[PDB]
Assembly symmetry: C2
Homo-oligomer: 212 residues x 2
């Protein structure tokens, strides 16, 4: 894990019936916990859902851990890790996503699957009424030998309202790794730019680990 | 919709990282609400998860509706319908599934996607400790112009215990259809036989609609 790394990504998924494939390329600085990506819709253009639901599936190797917190992500390399996630929205939309993260040379590779079901037809995902994810703090804890992370997320709506989502993530190291204690990872996630139908997006993430 | 119909099916999915593809062929009697299928694992043999989680994704056209309940399934044809489903288990496993059901001639075709995440490593899905689904009663009601069905499900464990799962299904007719009122569909679902690792399975479903 150098201090400059490059990121590659393919995501395939179905949201509410609609198939899509999206690829990204980008760059990040693992130790500063920042990363940026450029994303291109390859299939299923144009998307009939809020692009914002996908963004958080687009690598916690990219988080700044102090020296008193064992970094579960960085230690899993070179061999790697995978995570799985459920995203449960307050109106009944439910998303499943995973990622298989591999390292090869100076690049991180990401193999993503994302599936959304039961979004109400006139709710904020289907009527594209989302503006952003508010920052958040993910809680990280060990269970059955493996790392899990929990966050209450909220999307800011067009209108000033919020739409809540509970994330549950299990991260699995492909080898043994010094387990950490209960800690937090702050997140800030931002569409830096996009073209009209979100066929092209530039995404940024700032994440920092801490203890409270 | 004759009184004998034949069923064909491909399912692709990932449970806990493991990819699989399963095909089925079978027969059913739409008006008597019974149906049987033979299922073959084509890819991902052998499965490291309880096969029972999949069975309910393997068509409510196959339910006996009395004459006072508008049949939403049978009326959608010839054009068809699709459903999406979330399955939320009590230990945190979460499944997403869908089906696109098409009719062509005397055959029903079924295009399934199934994804499971966050099953605890030593829980009853991952340690194959499930024996069956108890019968159930799905509640059916109209919301935002479309049919939804809700059930509290329970798998009988090896040991005599139960493992609970909440199903939420949205069924979407590909055309206008006379909407029904609040009703129930009773279910009984059974592995009639299997070979050791469940590469071959024979599955039966009996479902009956009613009003309480």
């Amino acid at each position: 894990i150098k201090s400059d790394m490059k990121i590659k990504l393919r995501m395939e998924g179905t949201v509410n019936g609609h198939k899509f494939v999206i690829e990204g390329e980008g760059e990040g600085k693992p130790y500063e916990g920042t990363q940026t990506m450029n994303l291109k819709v390859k299939e299923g253009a144009p998307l009939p859902f809020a692009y914002d639901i996908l963004t958080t599936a687009f690598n916690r190797v990219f988080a700044k851990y102090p020296k008193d917190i064992p970094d579960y992500f960085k230690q899993s390399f070179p061999e790697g890790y995978s995570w799985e996630r459920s995203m449960t929205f307050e109106d009944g939309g439910i998303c499943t996503a995973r990622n298989d993260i591999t390292l090869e040379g100076d690049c991180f590779f990401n193999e993503i699957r994302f599936d959304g079901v039961n979004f109400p037809p006139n709710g904020p995902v289907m009527q594209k009424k989302t503006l952003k994810w508010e920052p958040s703090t993910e809680k990280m804890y060990v269970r059955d030998g493996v790392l899990m992370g929990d966050v209450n997320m909220a999307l800011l709506l067009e209108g000033g309202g919020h739409y809540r989502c509970d994330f549950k993530t299990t991260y699995k190291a492909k080898k043994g790794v010094q387990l950490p204690d209960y800690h937090f990872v702050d997140h800030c996630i931002e569409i830096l730019s996009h073209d009209k139908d979100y066929n092209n997006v530039k995404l940024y993430e700032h994440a920092v680990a801490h203890s409270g």
